[PDB]
Design a binder for these strands. Sequence first.
DNA 1: AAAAATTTTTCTAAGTCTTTTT
DNA 2: AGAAAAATTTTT
DNA 3: AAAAAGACTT
Lengths: 426, 52
Amino acid sequence: DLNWWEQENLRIAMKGERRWETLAHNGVLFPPEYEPHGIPIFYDGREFKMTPEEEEVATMFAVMKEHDYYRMEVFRRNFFESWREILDKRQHPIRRLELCDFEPIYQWHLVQREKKLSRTKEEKKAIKEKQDAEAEPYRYCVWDGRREQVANFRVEPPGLFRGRGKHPLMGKLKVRVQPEDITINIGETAEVPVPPAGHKWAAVQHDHTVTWLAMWRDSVAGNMKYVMLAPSSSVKGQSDMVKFEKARKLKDKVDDIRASYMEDFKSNDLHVAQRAVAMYFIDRLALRVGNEKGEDEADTVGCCSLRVEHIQLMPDNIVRFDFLGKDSIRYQNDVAVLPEVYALLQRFTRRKSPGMDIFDQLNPTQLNDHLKSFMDGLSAKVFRTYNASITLDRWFKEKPWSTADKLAYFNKANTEVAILCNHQKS
Amino acid sequence: KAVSLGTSKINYIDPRIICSWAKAQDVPINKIFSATIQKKFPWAMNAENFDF
DNA sequence: AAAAATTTTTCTAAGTCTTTTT
DNA sequence: AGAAAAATTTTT
DNA sequence: AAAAAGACTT
């Protein structure tokens, strides 16, 4: 009856291996069915009535009037196309978004928000009490006999897609998930969650090699969504510790990796030399590896996808980086590099136009395969974990007061980690 | 845009590094990890003279 | 008592990276 | 991963 | 080989 980290010689299972013996859970909490308000809009000055389905999607946009999205052309265009797909099932006069007046619905929404804000403390407790009753059968599962919290058991409600940065699909409708969209993953001998009356699940499976309880395919881009356990669960904890244990194992292999890529700087093989500069960047600067993105995604880059436009070669072996990375967070840094790397970068860019790739002969697959030659499980993301953790360690050890003064000291050592990682909040 | 300290503590720093230093300098855990992030890292709480 | 500021939690988007399919 | 909502603490 | 599917972390 120990906890799993006080256990003597436990084998933690890895991704794709057998993860559980038994799994029981109650499925997913579906948001409430749409409740129409019957408020019209006005098109080119004339009142216009809507089916509940049209009205729901109109309301999604109308309600976003004060948001920056509402005034973005791509957002407005994608909304209108989505809305018209619904509207075009019947006869209607809607041809241009500019001529749609959503004001009665907006005003309805402001009345509903005021009514919600001005309920009593006792009225907002009988509401919080009724919802937590509703969620209670779904907050927990039983994984190998142990009770674990489930994280995202509430199915995503429909809405206008909120893409980060310059996402080409921002405003597009994310449609309502039905039971028929959802695959249940559960134990062979468990009680199967009952679908809502009149509906069925997509499928019920019993895959012991995965950690998810339910899955659906999202309508915006077909992205697979999963109900998984809370971070407090042992399956998350164990994979979380194993992750930090590989960063620690990298600490000991690091010197040998650097001597290896420094020899590759002098390679006449173009792939090898490019591979070397990329692993130099990932090591020293903790860049993400940068997988290729589709035409229906925002244009962002990491290491392997940097383009000529993203770096600028300055006088004293200094490289100026300027690019949007994951989440369209800007990375700006002036970096003094090895002269051998700076010269390689001149080679990698010399007669190329700004939109061309710097590492045109290197992809993340090749980089991560090479890394497996140094250490099992080693991949580019591990350097980032290694860099963040080793940066805090070093600071505590080479820069060692009141309980509050010692916290300001922590905040500052944390800030150095966050700067290296380029973590930002608006 | 400001520097964000949460992401690295939540995902990137070995929590045993934080827990070791907090016990060796008698700083309460509760002023670094919230209730929820403590429940994320129970395998790290016991924080012993830890060398990453 | 209210308002403001600040921290925490919830939400879901956006990455990584291995396996499977073509 | 950061945005936003929600909760909590600090200021007035 | 290359692309897509798939599952997991951030």
